[PDB]
Amino acid sequence: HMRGTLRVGTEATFPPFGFKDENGKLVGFDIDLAKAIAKKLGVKVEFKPMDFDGIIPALQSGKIDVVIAGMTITEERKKQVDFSDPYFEAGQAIVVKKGNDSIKSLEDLKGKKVGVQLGSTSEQHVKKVAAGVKVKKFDNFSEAFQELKSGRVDAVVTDNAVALAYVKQNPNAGVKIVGETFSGEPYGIAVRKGNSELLEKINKALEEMKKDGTYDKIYEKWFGE
């Protein structure tokens, strides 16, 4: 059976991928991508915004049909979900106060307080470098960034376009990006393991979108030429 409604697990605090406009509506690159894929499949989207660490459980337990949530494809995750072909390539970045000149890389988080999203690749990357780093873990990244603003952490680590977005969205916070890398986090759309019928349709849609202009129009909307 082809579901007429695809329940899409997504972010709500992960600009420019999944966040809320000024009327509380979900927007972002992943929101636009989901709608485009749904249109090619002939179905409607129902978004389920949720904290990231609950996304794999949601998909495995049948709360959602698909994940478009800035989710990096990893070999370990492929034991938990099936992924589409990659739809985006991200990197990493660290956000610090403008005043700070001690932190230029993950190496420099030595004996510092650092915030990360629970369940993220960022959390894995920082766990590795931590040399006595004090890691604080958050249910969503807006909470992490809250603690940076208040001085509860000295840095927050996330995907590079989200770090940039937080900086652009918060001039009054007097923050800046350091340690930026540009690749190494391929994003994929995930479906339940063994849902080959839906995965094939999603792959085909993505391939068509990259051919026909649809993908490149979404990319330009969010990132420019």
Residues in touch with ligand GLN (CB under 6 A): 11, 14, 52, 69-72, 117, 120-121, 159, 185
What gap in Å lies between CA 213 and CA 217, rounded to an integer?
A: 6
Cβ distance 47 to 66 under 8 Å?
Answer: no
Question: Would you say 75 or 225 has its CB closer to ligand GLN?
Answer: 75
What's the min distance (Å) between Cβ of 137 and ligand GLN?
Answer: 12
Comparing CB distances to ligand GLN, the nearer of 41 and 184 is: 184
CB atoms under 10 Å from CB of 180, counted, come to 12
Amino acid residing at 173? A
How far apart are alpha carbons 3 and 191 in whole angstroms? 13
Least Å distance between CB 33 and ligand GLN? 14
Minimum Å gap between C-beta 13 and ligand GLN is: 8
Antiparallel, parallel or unpaired: β 92-97 and 175-178: antiparallel
Residue 18 C-beta: closest distance to ligand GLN, Å:
8
Rounded Cα distance, 176 and 97, in Å? 6
Angle, CA 73 vertex, CA 207 and CA 11 arms, to 5°: 90
The distance of closest approach from Cβ of residue 69 to ligand GLN in the complex, given in angstroms and rounded to an integer, is 5
- Residue 190 or 205 having the CB closest to ligand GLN: 190
Neighbours of 202 (CB within 10 A): 26
